[PDB]
Design a protein that fits this description.
Chain B: Belongs to the tubulin family. Chain B: It is found in: Cytoplasm, Cytoskeleton. This is part of a larger assembly, with chains A (51 residues) and B (216 residues). Chain A is low in regular secondary structure and 51 residues long. Chain A has no helices and no strands. The N and C termini of chain A lie far apart (125 Å). Chain B starts with a strand and ends in a 9-residue tail after the last helix. Chain B is globular, with a radius of gyration of 17 Å. Chain B has a six-stranded parallel sheet with strand order 5-4-1-6-7-8. In chain B, strand 4, helix 2 and strand 5 form a beta-alpha-beta unit. Chain B contains seven helices and eight strands. The chains are: A little secondary structure (51), B alpha/beta (216). Chains A and B meet through loops of A and strand 5 and helix 4 of B. The structure holds guanosine-5'-triphosphate and magnesium ion. Magnesium ion (MG) binds next to loops of chain B.
């Protein structure tokens, strides 16, 4: 008679490459990045000892 | 086809994955280098240079318990990308490492899941060792189950969970962070087995003959 069923296919589990990544979480965690803010000039007031 | 992937959340999760993986490495001979001095393919991805890579998942939020295993006696064997931890420890809190920063790192943990499991055919199940009483292995474990229930489909997942028994309680927030994860694991788990640190205690007392043990 006529012979084989050819068959095909596999399983696959994960959702392909459909998950973004840019969290900067360097394996053990989001490591670093320091943020320095501009400051001002410290001053004071005056007095009157004599004249 | 017989491959199983482990997931291990919490400080408890990594230090009870470590001893279990030591037993795994002893049950069929692989050196801590990760070389030869059907049992191999389920957990160890064979390389073109004879190396064996454990296909686990070790995830945390406190680096000081996972930084040790990348500087310990097994640091040759474990892949560095898989040993994930965080910057801030959740510290008995559900929501930091679920909404603010663990929202940001579940992205990379799921990327590592996708990168690890792509070279397999027979993913037969997942193994999760979660912390009911902790902060990391409660909240991040919960987020893992919420994403894994909908993205992997109807894949089997199993819980060898830990459960702070009412007699011996380490922290006081065991009715405070475990109830919400019990609600999570009710609808997003298939088999869940509880362990406690009181039954092991008296079997080590009378059935075993070792006094003053550690968690190790
Ligand atoms: N059964 C068992 N329980 C453990 C073990 N080690 C720690 N625990 C439990 O874990 C709890 C400690 O909190 P962790 O699970 O470590 O929480 P964490 O991973 O540090 O994350 P945070 O809570 O945010 O700090 C304790 O209440 C213990 O009961 C262990 O080796 N075996
Ligand atoms: Mg922790």
């Amino acid at each position: 008679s006529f012979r084989g069923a050819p068959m095909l296919l596999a399983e696959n589990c994960s959702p392909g490459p459909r998950y973004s990544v840019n969290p900067k979480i360097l394996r053990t965690g989001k490591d670093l990045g320091p943020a320095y803010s501009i400051l001002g000039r410290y001053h004071t007031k005056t007095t009157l000892t004599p004249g | 086809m017989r491959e199983c992937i482990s997931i291990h959340v919490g400080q408890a999760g990594v230090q009870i994955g470590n001893a279990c993986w030591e037993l795994y490495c002893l049950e069929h001979g692989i050196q801590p280098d990760g070389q030869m001095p059907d049992s191999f393919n389920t957990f160890f991805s064979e390389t073109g240079a004879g190396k064996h890579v454990p296909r686990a998942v070790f995830v945390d939020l406190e680096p000081t318990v996972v930084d040790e295993v990348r500087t310990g006696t097994y640091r040759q064997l474990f892949h560095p990308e898989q040993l994930i931890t965080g910057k801030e420890d959740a510290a008995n809190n559900y929501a930091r490492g679920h909404y603010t920063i663990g929202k940001e790192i579940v992205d990379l943990v799921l990327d590592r899941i996708r990168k690890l499991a792509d070279l397999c055919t027979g993913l037969q199940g997942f193994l999760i060792f979660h912390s009911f009483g902790g902060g990391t292995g409660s909240g991040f474990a919960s987020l893992l189950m919420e994403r894994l229930s909908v993205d992997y489909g109807k894949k089997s997942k199993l819980e060898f969970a830990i459960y702070p028994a009412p007699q011996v309680s380490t922290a006081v927030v065991e009715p405070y962070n475990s109830i919400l994860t019990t609600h999570t694991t009710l609808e997003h788990s298939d088999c869940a087995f509880m362990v406690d640190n009181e039954a092991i205690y008296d079997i080590c007392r009378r059935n075993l003959d070792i006094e003053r043990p550690t968690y190790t």
